[PDB]
Ligand binder design. Structure first.
Ligand SMILES: C[n+]1cn([C@@H]2O[C@H](COP(=O)(O)OP(=O)(O)O)[C@@H](O)[C@H]2O)c2nc(N)[nH]c(=O)c21
Ligand code: NA
Ligand code: NA
Ligand code: NA
Ligand code: NA
Ligand code: NA
Ligand code: NA
Ligand code: NA
Ligand code: NA
Ligand code: NA
Length: 210
């Protein structure tokens, strides 16, 4: 990708614009994402601990005696989340479930006050991986990600850089991860059937092949 191509991807849930920019803004809480490449050359992706759908559902409750859920969202939730919703009612079965669902996200987080971009990336990578990810080298390319969530009608902005890390894929793939932010770190190329695979793959390719 050249300095001024903008590419717009669409999935059943998201529209996302990816555009190469020169500098990251820094205001209140800028969001910075790490596209991590392992020592053995694998692109990494996180499975968010809480799905976007279950986060939203929880935020929509307003009564101790009423629980409300759009059934369209059931296919975008984890097993434990579905169990929590239906734990008291316990009907025979439920419909529209995807047992393969995972909420794929680039690792990363919010920029602190007067925190450098690279320090933010190092710190968030450490927090989200239980101290198991360190950065050998940062890439040059900076992408701005603009995402519209089609289900909730919200727009999000973040910025992404490449992080070539010291760890191998296997280094991050024996021990389960205990974060409140992340339930798994895995190879993006183990996720070919995910709604997000095409645009995440594009991000990695643009960051390393430009
Ligand atoms: C709640 N939420 C967060 N994101 C993404 O996650 C990034 C950070 O999300 P955040 O809302 O800024 O902080 P949070 O993780 O504590 O919620 C955003 O820049 C978005 O990329 C989300 N992305 C989509 N498509 N839908 C969502 O509901 C959503
Ligand atoms: Na941001
Ligand atoms: Na049952
Ligand atoms: Na149902
Ligand atoms: Na299920
Ligand atoms: Na999905
Ligand atoms: Na994304
Ligand atoms: Na590390
Ligand atoms: Na290591
Ligand atoms: Na998806």
């Amino acid at each position: 990708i050249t300095m001024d191509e903008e590419v717009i991807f669409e999935t059943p849930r998201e529209l996302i614009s990816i555009k190469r920019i020169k500098d990251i803004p820094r205001s209140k809480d800028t969001h910075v994402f790490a596209a991590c490449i392992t020592s053995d050359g694998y692109p990494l992706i996180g499975a968010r601990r809480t799905s976007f759908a279950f986060q939203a559902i929880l935020s929509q409750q307003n009564s101790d005696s009423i629980f409300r859920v759009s059934t369209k969202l059931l296919r975008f939730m984890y097993y434990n989340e579905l169990r929590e919703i239906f734990r008291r009612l316990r009907k025979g079965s439920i419909n529209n479930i995807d047992p393969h669902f995972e909420e794929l996200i680039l690792l990363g987080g919010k920029l602190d006050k007067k925190e450098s971009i690279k320090d933010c990336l190092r710190r968030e990578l450490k927090e989200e991986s239980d101290e198991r990810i360190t950065v050998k080298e940062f890439g040059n390319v900076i992408l701005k990600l603009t995402t519209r969530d089609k289900l909730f009608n919200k727009v999000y902005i973040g910025y992404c850089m490449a992080c070539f890390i010291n760890q191998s894929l296997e280094d991050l793939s024996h021990t389960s991860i205990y974060n409140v932010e992340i339930r798994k770190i895995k190879s993006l190329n183990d996720c070919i059937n995910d709604d997000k695979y095409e645009y995440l793959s594009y991000i990695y390719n643009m960051l390393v092949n430009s």
